[PDB]
Amino acid sequence: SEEGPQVKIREASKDNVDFILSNVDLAMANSLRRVMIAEIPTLAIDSVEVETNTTVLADEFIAHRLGLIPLQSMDIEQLEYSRDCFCEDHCDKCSVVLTLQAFGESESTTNVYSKDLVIVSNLMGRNIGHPIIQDKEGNGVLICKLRKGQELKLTCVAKKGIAKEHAKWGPAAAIEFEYDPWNKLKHTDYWYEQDSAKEWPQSKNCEYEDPPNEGDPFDYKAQADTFYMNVESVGSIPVDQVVVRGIDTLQKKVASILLALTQM
């Protein structure tokens, strides 16, 4: 198809995609996992101002949870980082503002969910700031539960951010990396009481590659261009978009280096 790296997806899902990376240097794949973890932009609440708190949970606690709450970021490239924007505090294009009030009307403790949070700022026809709920009930992630006689009343400002700045902005939770599953490269030396094969289970990624034969000598020149990877999405950004944004973000970083050289 295309000269250079080739990708064969083993498994597809909304949450996760498992793929096989071929004709790739390891350094680029490591850099891609790192740009996927850290650099990809996301929308999470950066400011919380609460008027009334009757919750047993402290305000700082709830604010940290709210920052950890997932918000949609597919159109986050249309959204702008507030520091790049000229508004004094926030404009409608750079910040998405959520309001949430929850009282304990019921004697039974009343749960507070991400679906209860609502947006006051204008959508401008972009899929930004929607609370993310994978729960089958549709009930949002619970911030607090409030006994009768308790009301909580707060506003939240969500700005563009990156996971290097704070872990809440990470689109992906875990990235699975595998290379040299058969240990032909012998990058790792097995610690074995009696036998290494008995002591270390064969990975699922060994069986795809052809098993090594004990007859042939080890090749010093050989380097592994085939890797087995898996990407898991929180849901704020779809998996294909998450990995594509990792690729693109690394490309923008490289281009920024190049244009800095041109300015020099």
Partner: protein, 773 residues
């Protein structure tokens, strides 16, 4: 006692310490708020006016800043609130209290303060985070470990004070300890383990890692080393990059066990010109002990190169280990089933022997032992039985332990772990001892309420068969708790007693300093020592060397050191000396050689008199072997050519060198005699190390090389002389004090109690004894 000896001091800070690989050994990581709060008064100079104006503009909030400005009148100008804060323009003679900046001298101190090594000058590097950052190598003299440890920083306020701190108290200067004649700082923990693993011949480094490690050495030659293996693939041994880290021109040889030139064990090290030929890097090579690479680097070039070497070794080794990794694990403690069966069998055989001895005691068919009660003999035999059982079990464990075992890797590196740790973890923790005894029956005839009465078995008396992995029984756990309780109480008591003892020693010896006449004297002038240390030489730069004249066969000593020009066999072979054919006969030269031989024989008799043991190695001023090695590598003599050097000139030059070294300058016959007494053993060493026969046999020294060796020996001895004014008594007291803290516990008073009796000069003695010969 409190306020005058020790004051609460301005410009003093305190912080929790953490360890940073990248920060240089002399540097200290000073928190930004600490530097901002701390002020150094700097008089405004024509060079610094621009910088100081910029600092004042930047302000107290942001460093580089200045908190206060002192006028020529001296009225305080406060930067935080001033109507002229932006108005001021610097005027000469003013003082700016600058914020503490990078590469500025301070003092870093640990509260036990047993040693001068606990208080050392440090370069400042301002760090972002809150904890004091320091190098790992400086932990050992500071006696600190990163478990909430807290250390103090003191800032000089005067330029003379700064110069004192930099010229005397600097970390590279105090690298070598005066006491124990060894450097204080060595490569510790992961750097030592990693340098060992890198130095293994199995370990090989690819060109990408090689280039990154080359770059990692802050000063790199720029030349990629030629690969150890080229044609199959350009493989590089870790020893080669490590050698690129080793400074050029320094040569070390260490012979341990079977240090064959082939060295299949790879034990020992050979380095020439800072390039390692053979070896696996071990703790002693990189250790604080003398004969280590640190001492050689400190002596040959200086302290600064040594500290830089610490840094470079740390960086390269930490990068390589970072890629390789390391993990102690459960399984490194676990042991094979077969070895475990042998372990249990060993313990069982010990128990069977103990029960048979107990039966023989019950039968009263036990031989009378002179000077001890028969019960005492029984107790000693059972205790020794259990001790041997535990030790043999540990030996079985270690042999069972693979080369991959990480505790074994630390022990081979020497960084951590002990044989006893492995034995307790895998086979048997041992037999608990309380008050120097097996566990006693608190209940009448029963050590524990579960135990039956009158049981003298090791399980009743507290021997723990089980390892730490298998787990202690409740009785074993209680007895081990008794032992640990005694350990903690003894530790606290030892700390208190040693603090008092150190203070008494310091107060008794403090006033005595080497005066300008080189006589060790108190303030009143009463001479403690006419020549300090009886040789008049600084305790630093003194390394143990072997005197070849002492010991050995008289015939062998004659063969190595005697050359007779008259006998054909005795005269040197003409390949050794161009004069040699002319030398045959030459009776007037033979009489000079006979005179030097008579001097060697008298010196041998004297040294045999000094030590009945006649131990070869004793602390000595100048290491001759290193000088000879440096000469051989500097002049690159093939040793095929006959020596340029006259047979007369070796003897006359050695005599001239003896005349050249004076501990005391004065031309007083008493002072001359005392000087000869001071350098008597050194002269013996010099004559033994370089005999005419030896000078031509051990090497083909060019006459220029022998002259260079003579000049270097003279210079080194003059370096080794004690600096006048040095406060010797405080150093002596601290020298006793820190090891005295370190000591932890055939029936004689020992350790702190024995020391306390010695210091109190008390008539009563807990354990008097006469050694009848």
């Amino acid at each position: 006692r409190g306020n005058l000896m020790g004051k609460r001091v301005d410009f003093s800070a305190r912080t929790v310490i953490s360890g940073d690989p990248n920060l240089e050994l002399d540097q200290v990581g000073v928190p930004k708020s600490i530097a901002k709060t701390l002020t150094y008064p700097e008089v405004v100079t024509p060079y610094n006016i621009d910088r100081l104006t910029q600092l004042v503009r930047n302000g107290p909030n942001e460093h580089p800043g200045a908190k206060y400005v002192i006028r020529d009148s001296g009225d305080r100008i406060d930067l935080r609130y001033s109507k002229r804060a932006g108005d001021i323009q610097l005027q000469y003679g003013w003082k700016v209290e600058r914020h503490i900046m990078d590469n500025d001298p301070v003092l870093f101190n640990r509260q036990p303060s047993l040693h001068k090594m606990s208080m050392m000058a440090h370069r400042v590097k301002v760090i972002p985070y809150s904890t004091f950052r320091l190098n790992l190598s400086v932990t050992s003299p500071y006696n600190a470990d990163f478990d909430g440890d807290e250390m103090n920083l003191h800032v000089p306020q005067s330029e003379e004070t700064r110069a004192e701190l930099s010229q005397l108290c600097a970390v590279p200067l105090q690298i070598v300890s005066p006491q124990s004649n060894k450097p204080c700082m060595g490569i510790v923990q992961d750097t030592l383990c990693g340098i060992r693993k890198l130095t293994l011949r199995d370990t090989f480094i690819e060109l990408d890692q090689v280039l990154n490690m080359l770059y990692w050495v802050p000063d790199w030659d720029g030349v990629i080393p030629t690969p150890a293996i080229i044609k199959p693939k350009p493989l590089w041994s870790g020893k080669q990059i490590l050698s690129v880290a080793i400074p050029n021109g320094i040569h070390l040889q260490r012979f341990d066990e079977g240090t064959t030139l082939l060295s299949p064990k790879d034990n020992g090290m050979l380095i020439i010109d800072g390039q390692i030929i053979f070896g696996v890097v071990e703790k002693k090579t990189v250790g604080s002990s003398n004969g280590g690479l640190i001492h050689v680097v400190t002596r040959e070039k200086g302290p600064q190169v040594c500290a830089k070497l610490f840094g470079n070794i740390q960086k390269v080794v930490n990068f390589w280990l970072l890629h390789n990794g390391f993990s102690t694990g459960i399984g490194d403690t676990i042991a094979d089933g077969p070895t475990m069966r042998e372990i249990t069998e060993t313990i069982a055989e010990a128990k069977k022997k103990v029960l048979d001895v107990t039966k023989e005691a019950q039968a009263n068919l036990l031989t009378a032992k002179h000077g001890m009660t028969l019960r005492e003999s029984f107790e000693d035999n059972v205790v020794r039985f259990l001790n041997e059982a535990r030790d043999k079990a540990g030996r079985l464990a270690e042999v069972n332990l693979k080369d991959l075992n990480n505790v074994k890797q630390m022990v081979m590196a020497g960084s951590k772990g002990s044989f006893i740790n492995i034995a307790q973890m895998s086979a048997c923790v041992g037999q608990q001892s309380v008050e120097g005894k097996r566990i006693a029956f608190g209940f009448v005839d029963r050590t524990l309420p579960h135990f039956s009465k009158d049981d003298y078995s090791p399980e009743s008396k507290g021997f723990v068969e089980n390892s730490y992995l298998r787990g202690l029984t409740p009785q074993e756990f209680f007895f081990h708790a008794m032992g640990g309780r005694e350990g903690l109480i003894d530790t606290a008591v030892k700390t208190a007693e040693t603090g008092y003892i150190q203070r008494r020693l310091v107060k008794a010896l403090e006033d005595i300093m080497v005066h300008y006449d080189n006589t060790t004297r108190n303030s009143l002038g009463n001479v403690i020592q006419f020549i300090y240390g009886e040789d008049g030489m600084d305790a630093a730069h003194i390394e143990k060397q072997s005197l070849d004249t002492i010991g050995g066969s008289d015939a062998a000593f004659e063969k190595r050191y005697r050359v007779d020009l008259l006998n054909t066999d005795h005269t040197l072979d003409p390949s050794l000396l161009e004069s040699g054919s002319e030398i045959l006969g030459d009776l007037k030269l033979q009489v000079l050689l006979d005179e030097e031989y008579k001097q060697l024989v008298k010196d041998r008799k004297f040294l045999r008199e000094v030590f009945v043991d006649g131990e070869a190695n004793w602390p000595l001023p100048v290491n001759i072997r290193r000088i000879i090695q440096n000469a051989q590598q500097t002049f690159h003599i093939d040793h095929t050519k006959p020596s340029d050097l006259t047979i007369k000139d070796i003897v006359l030059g050695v005599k001239d060198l003896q005349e050249n070294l004076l501990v005391l300058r004065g031309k007083n016959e008493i002072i001359q005699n005392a000087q000869r007494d001071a350098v008597t053993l050194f002269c013996c060493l010099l004559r033994s190390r370089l005999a005419t026969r030896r000078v031509l046999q051990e090497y083909r020294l060019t006459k220029q090389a022998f002259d260079w060796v003579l000049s270097n020996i003279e210079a080194q001895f003059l370096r080794s002389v004690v600096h006048p004014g040095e406060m010797v008594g405080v150093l002596a007291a601290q020298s006793i004090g820190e090891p005295a803290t370190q000591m932890t516990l055939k029936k004689v008073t020992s350790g702190v109690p024995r020391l306390k009796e010695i210091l109190n000069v008390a008539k009563n003695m807990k354990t008097p004894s006469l050694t009848v010969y």
